Amino acid sequence: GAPWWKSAVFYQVYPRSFKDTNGDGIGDFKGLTEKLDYLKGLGIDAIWINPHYASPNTDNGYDISDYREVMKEYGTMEDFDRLMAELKKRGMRLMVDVVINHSSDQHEWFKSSRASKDNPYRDYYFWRDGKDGHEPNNYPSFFGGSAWEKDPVTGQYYLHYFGRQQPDLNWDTPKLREELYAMLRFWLDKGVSGMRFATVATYSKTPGFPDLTPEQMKNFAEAYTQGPNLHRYLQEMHEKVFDHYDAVTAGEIFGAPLNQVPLFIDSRRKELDMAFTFDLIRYDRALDRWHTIPRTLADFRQTIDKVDAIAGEYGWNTFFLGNHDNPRAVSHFGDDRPQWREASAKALATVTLTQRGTPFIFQGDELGMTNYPFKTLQDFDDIEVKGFFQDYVETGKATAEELLTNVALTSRDNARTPFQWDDSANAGFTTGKPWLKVNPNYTEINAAREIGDPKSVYSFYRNLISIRHETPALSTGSYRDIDPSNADVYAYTRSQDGETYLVVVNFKAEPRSFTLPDGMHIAETLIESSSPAAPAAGAASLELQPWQSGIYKVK
Numbered sequence: 001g002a003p004w005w006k007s008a009v010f011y012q013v014y015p016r017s018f019k020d021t022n023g024d025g026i027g028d029f030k031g032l033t034e035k036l037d038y039l040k041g042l043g044i045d046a047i048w049i050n051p052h053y054a055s056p057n058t059d060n061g062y063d064i065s066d067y068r069e070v071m072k073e074y075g076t077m078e079d080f081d082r083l084m085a086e087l088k089k090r091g092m093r094l095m096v097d098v099v100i101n102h103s104s105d106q107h108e109w110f111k112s113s114r115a116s117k118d119n120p121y122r123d124y125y126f127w128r129d130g131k132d133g134h135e136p137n138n139y140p141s142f143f144g145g146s147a148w149e150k151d152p153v154t155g156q157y158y159l160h161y162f163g164r165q166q167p168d169l170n171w172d173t174p175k176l177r178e179e180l181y182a183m184l185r186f187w188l189d190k191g192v193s194g195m196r197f198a199t200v201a202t203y204s205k206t207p208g209f210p211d212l213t214p215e216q217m218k219n220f221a222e223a224y225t226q227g228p229n230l231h232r233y234l235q236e237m238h239e240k241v242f243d244h245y246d247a248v249t250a251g252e253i254f255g256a257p258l259n260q261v262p263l264f265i266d267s268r269r270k271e272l273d274m275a276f277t278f279d280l281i282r283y284d285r286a287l288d289r290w291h292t293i294p295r296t297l298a299d300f301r302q303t304i305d306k307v308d309a310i311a312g313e314y315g316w317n318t319f320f321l322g323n324h325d326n327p328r329a330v331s332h333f334g335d336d337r338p339q340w341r342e343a344s345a346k347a348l349a350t351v352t353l354t355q356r357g358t359p360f361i362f363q364g365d366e367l368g369m370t371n372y373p374f375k376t377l378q379d380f381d382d383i384e385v386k387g388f389f390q391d392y393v394e395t396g397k398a399t400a401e402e403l404l405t406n407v408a409l410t411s412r413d414n415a416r417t418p419f420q421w422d423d424s425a426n427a428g429f430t431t432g433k434p435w436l437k438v439n440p441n442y443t444e445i446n447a448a449r450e451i452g453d454p455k456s457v458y459s460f461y462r463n464l465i466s467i468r469h470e471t472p473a474l475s476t477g478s479y480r481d482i483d484p485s486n487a488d489v490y491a492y493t494r495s496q497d498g499e500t501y502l503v504v505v506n507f508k509a510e511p512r513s514f515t516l517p518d519g520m521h522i523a524e525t526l527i528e529s530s531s532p533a534a535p536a537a538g539a540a541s542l543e544l545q546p547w548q549s550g551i552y553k554v555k
Ligand SMILES: OC[C@H]1O[C@@H](O)[C@H](O)[C@@H](O)[C@@H]1O
Pocket: 059, 062, 063, 099, 162, 197, 198, 199, 252, 324, 325
């Protein structure tokens, strides 16, 4: 048999932007709880929530100052326990975000660590003498400037791959790893069903902190995933924690070459259960992470093909076209112009729900939400954009307008604008002023408008989730790309126990044709989007409308 997580459909909730119930403009636990009937109705089996722990929010939850307290903004431990209970009444499961590559610089461990070199917490972090009058080495940070920050209290620099207020935790220190395992046990003892591990591939650092080479410097994210003790630490965490619970684990494998992914997910290695990879979501992103390189569907499917292959026989992949760190799915992979937004959003839904692996739908994508129309750099909240400003504008490599032009298409903030519930003030997200502006298209794009409409993007996701739930080959069946070279129509099969399904999606806003492979004919049409008529039983070919998608049982 296959674990519940292999045939589950997950929904990712970014609490901060899902539903606010007290008018401070920030979503909270009570709002999410209020909306569980909505997600149950869509057909969601489990929810992954972004960090919900006490945090100064320099990186919206990913800078944790106390791993055993809930974030003040989201509510209390009681609201969290109530979220858990309400999910359970509905047979739903909760996956929480685990951030243990680093903590906030307000965590008590860090306040202690920085006091002196002999403090019992000194080695919970990485402290090192500067070199040749400057930092310990040339490591850059993802959020700007050096990954090393000098602390006058002792004269040494501490390590921070991410923000200056997100010091990296030292996994080479046994006592620190034991503190981390105990923390995990605290949440797992509360009944949590899954854990998503933030930047799980950077836990291990390189002994000696040598300078990155010129080449390594072009893609430093990759070098940070090459620590020598990485799998040893993940195997220990598994042996000491996960082997005693029934929780599914999912690693955010940020920066690692795809060839290394199996080391994290091969069930026999006893590390993680499934992977979140970045090969597809960043397939058209330049190395500097704020420019886009044009790509075709051929690149899209070939990437998916390579990723599916890495899961081999004992690994498992998650599948997603969107999350809180990337531009909106329909805007990024589809066509968000008014005339094609709904049609392309439905096509992308068909792709997402028929991929081999566990699908994660990001809040709002089921409604066809789009990127946001940023007008000035001041319209972004993201610390990452401030880091691009520091690294490229202040340095004269680019102008503020160039940064604006490009980052509008790639910013994480595109996925963080308030969820569009209805067409009331601020789309019903809040009675106050939203922490991030609501997209003006909320008047045409909102859940209340779509839930009662048989033809809406929402209803289409809902029917796809039902179809996937009733069709085993669609979750655990094999996957085969029919033609990796085709840049027009994405076609593939899913098979299991003699049943084979065909998925065909036109990625062009023009009619196209698709001829089934020799000896294959349509048997039944499960569903189609943007189609005036289902093909006839026995069809050897398909005529497709712009952005048409469909799932068919073949014979
Ligand atoms: O904490 C650093 C980063 O970790 C990633 O796992 C999260 O998805 C990002 O949102 C965050 O900025």
